[PDB]
Design an enzyme around this catalytic site. Sequence first.
Site, PDB file in Angstrom:
ATOM      1  CB  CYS A   1      38.560  24.603  37.383  1.00  0.00           C
ATOM      2  SG  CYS A   1      37.224  24.190  38.552  1.00  0.00           S
ATOM      3  CG  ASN A  76      35.699  22.388  34.535  1.00  0.00           C
ATOM      4  OD1 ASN A  76      35.313  21.461  35.237  1.00  0.00           O
ATOM      5  ND2 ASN A  76      35.894  23.603  35.013  1.00  0.00           N
ATOM      6  CB  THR A  78      30.956  22.654  36.386  1.00  0.00           C
ATOM      7  OG1 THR A  78      32.166  21.943  36.665  1.00  0.00           O
ATOM      8  CG2 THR A  78      29.888  21.741  35.847  1.00  0.00           C
ATOM      9  CG  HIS A  79      36.045  27.721  36.021  1.00  0.00           C
ATOM     10  ND1 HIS A  79      36.217  29.075  35.829  1.00  0.00           N
ATOM     11  CD2 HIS A  79      36.812  27.394  37.085  1.00  0.00           C
ATOM     12  CE1 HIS A  79      37.046  29.544  36.743  1.00  0.00           C
ATOM     13  NE2 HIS A  79      37.422  28.546  37.516  1.00  0.00           N
ATOM     14  CE  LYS A 252      66.671  48.753  21.510  1.00  0.00           C
ATOM     15  NZ  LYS A 252      66.081  49.925  20.754  1.00  0.00           N
ATOM     16  CE  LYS A 354      57.334  61.712  24.039  1.00  0.00           C
ATOM     17  NZ  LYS A 354      56.779  62.755  23.172  1.00  0.00           N
ATOM     18  N   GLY A 384      43.052  22.442  38.173  1.00  0.00           N
ATOM     19  CA  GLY A 384      42.409  23.302  39.133  1.00  0.00           C
ATOM     20  C   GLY A 384      42.944  23.011  40.518  1.00  0.00           C
ATOM     21  CB  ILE A 385      44.664  24.655  42.948  1.00  0.00           C
ATOM     22  CG1 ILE A 385      44.521  26.173  42.686  1.00  0.00           C
ATOM     23  CG2 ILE A 385      45.730  24.018  41.999  1.00  0.00           C
ATOM     24  CD1 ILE A 385      45.855  26.957  42.608  1.00  0.00           C
ATOM     25  CG  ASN A 405      38.704  27.705  45.310  1.00  0.00           C
ATOM     26  OD1 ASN A 405      39.841  27.676  44.856  1.00  0.00           O
ATOM     27  ND2 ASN A 405      38.457  27.660  46.614  1.00  0.00           N
TER      28      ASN A 405
END
Length: 405
Positions: A1, A76, A78-79, A252, A354, A384-385, A405
């Site tokens: 994914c 991907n 199909t995500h 900085k 301010k 993907g997971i 997912n």
Amino acid sequence: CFAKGTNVLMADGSIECIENIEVGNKVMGKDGRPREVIKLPRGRETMYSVVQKSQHRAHKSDSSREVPELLKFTCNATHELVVRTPRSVRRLSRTIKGVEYFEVITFEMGQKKAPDGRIVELVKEVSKSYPISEKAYFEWTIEARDLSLLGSHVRKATYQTYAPILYENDHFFDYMQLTIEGPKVLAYLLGLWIGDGLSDRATFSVDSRDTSLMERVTEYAEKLNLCAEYKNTENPLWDAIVGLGFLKDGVKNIPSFLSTDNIGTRETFLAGLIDSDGYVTDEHGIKATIKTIHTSVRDGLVSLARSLGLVVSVNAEPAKVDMNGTKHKISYAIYMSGGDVLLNVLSKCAGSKKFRPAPAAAFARECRGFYFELQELKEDDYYGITLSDDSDHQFLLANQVVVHN
């Protein structure tokens, strides 16, 4: 994914590439609570580039000069993107009537025939009054390869969201260098330094006419023991600039830990930074604007303000010119908005133009939306997971974009 290299936020506020994660690892959910990795799927196919829609910049390169889009990811074909589209009707309410034919234009859920042969469910713009399967928005999902079936309007109107970082560490307070009576003044004096400080030591540049700020600086210093040294020694303020990371390699910097630490400390740091070189307006909604010539501060501030649930945008500008010379090329303007989320930060500032009073009642840090654009890419290896089938099935990428997912 997700392409190789996608950073996800871990439930303890930690960051890791999509590929270096394994089952058991806990990602960060929408509520600031942990998710559970129970699978790690793979493959290869068309991949798409999802990026927030913006008025400018971003040419291909390795120099961080040009202002970059941080609300971006590669998934991907199909995500499943978690999106929202507004409900909407026109030239009639639900169903009013006049004479001699006229039109009612509406947004509603229907099924469209994908060119591939699939029969997808999505939001369609509809002509006159016709029922057939049709809160102020639609809460839904769409696969990357499918955005293209959307009609012009429904499509421009659709957006993704990002959630605030409601989770809190303590890297700040564990760095004593107690709680009640304390952290306020150093976090404040740190944001004040990144704004007006001298890179080589604890020396800021508080504006004379600003009696109210001079009052703050002197007041605060006293609380942290020091005083007058700024308006490099075993100086616990200079030791924190260094120790806590406010100098990204002789430059900085606004440290990453600031985005998952104590909320109050995030808001106090921002106040000092606004007091130093920011400015507030109320024209079309409360808004604060911090300026900086540093690229590291510019990007760290954007994720710091978004972790709180504020709306952020960045623009490039021209710098200074002494007698037509001194200092050159470019600096950056970072715009922040959000209502009571913002009122809660400004109510800690000292500058007279301010400071703004604190919210009237308690408030919630909502997920903010953002318009995006997709790029059909080539074939590639995806990762993907898989979150548990009983969870909300969602979690946050390192940039806070809420993914499915």
